[PDB]
Structure formats: C-alpha cells, structure tokens
C-alpha cells in the first residue's frame, strides 16, 4: 500500500516514520521496539517483555495482548475482560463479580461471597452455595438440594415436593395440603 511515506532519523539511530494517512511510528535503533501513534489518537506500544499494549482514545480503553494469546481489556468503568484463544471470556465487573462465558454457551458467575451460578444454554440454572446447598432452576420448577440429602422442589403451578433423606416423598398442593405421601 503506502508509498508517500517520510522517515526521519533519531540521534540515537532510531527512526520516526510518518505516513500520509497521519500514522506515526517510532522504531528503536535496534528495530526491536515499536510505538505507533495513529491519527485518531490511538496508541500501540510493543514491549521489552513482549506485551503489546493498545490504547483506544475514544473508548478510553487499554488492551493488552500477551505472548500466550490472552487479551485483556480494561474499560473506563473499571471493568476488565480476559479473552482466551479457545473463545472463553472472563469478565470482571466493577463490583468484582467474575463471570465466565464458555464456548458452548454456558456462563458461570462467582459472587463476592463465593456462591457460584451456572447458566446453561437451554436456560436452566444451577446455584451452588458455600453451605453445600445447590439450587436447580428450570422453566418448570425450582429445586433445592440440601446437605442432609433433603430435596425440595416447587413446581411452576405451586405444588411442592419434599424428598426426605430416607426416600420418603411428600407432595403438597398450592394450599399446603398433602396430596401424596410415600408411606
């Protein structure tokens, strides 16, 4: 592409190159370091330790690319995103929740208290608590699994099933009345 380009020579032996589209590039004397100052205000610095650091002037965002392929974006609202080469993304929101988006469509958030929420691509959720309790939410019911082995399920029509650690199963109508009991 570009032909109408201008180079100048730094006293240290580095080069400054100015391009007709406005882009400026600074190369060290060994050529090993490159600073690119784009016409739009963006800035790209390649590093000694090999990080590539890009600054988006309008969006006010920095974007680091690391040697293993990881990209890490730091947004003005103090939010950070890590993008991995298999397509996984890990978002750290301002309030320090971490959410991962996996390739398959799962999302997995970890809360400030260590509670884990997993959002499958079918719409169902799994919550896992510190206490050992799990909840499972599908479109038909919400199920709580307790550490003692008790499982309570509330269906979308308001019927509630308890399953006791022994295997006994009690089902109640919306009103609270037992309508089935496996003894």
């Amino acid at each position: 592409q570009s032909d109408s380009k201008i180079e100048k020579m730094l006293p240290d032996g580095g080069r400054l190159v100015v391009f007709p589209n406005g882009t400026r590039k600074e190369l060290s004397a060994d050529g090993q370091t490159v600073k690119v100052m784009f016409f739009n205000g963006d800035v790209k610095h390649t590093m000694p330790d090999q990080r590539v650091i890009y600054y988006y002037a309008e969006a006010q965002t920095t974007h680091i690319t690391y040697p293993d392929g990881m990209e890490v974006l730091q947004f003005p609202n103090n939010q950070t995103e890590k993008h991995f080469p298999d397509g996984r993304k890990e978002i750290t929101f301002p309030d320090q929740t971490v959410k991962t988006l996996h390739p398959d469509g799962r999302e997995e958030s970890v809360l400030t208290d260590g509670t884990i929420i997993q959002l499958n691509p079918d719409g169902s959720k799994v919550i896992q608590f510190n206490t050992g309790q799990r909840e499972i939410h599908t479109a038909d019911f919400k199920r709580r699994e307790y550490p003692d082995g008790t499982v309570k399920t509330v269906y979308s029509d308001g019927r509630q099933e308890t399953q006791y650690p022994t295997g006994r199963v009690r089902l109640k109508d919306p009103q609270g009345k037992v309508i089935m009991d496996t003894k």
């Binding site: 882009t23 784009f38 016409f39 988006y56 969006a59 609202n77 995103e81």
Partner: peptide
C-alpha cells in the same frame, strides 16, 4: 497494517 483497531465493546 497502519490502521487503527476497531473500537471495542464491553459486555453488558
């Protein structure tokens, strides 16, 4: 390349 990268978007 010489051209700026496209502006990026945070996740909602």
């Amino acid at each position: 390349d010489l051209s700026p990268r496209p502006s990026p978007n945070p996740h909602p």
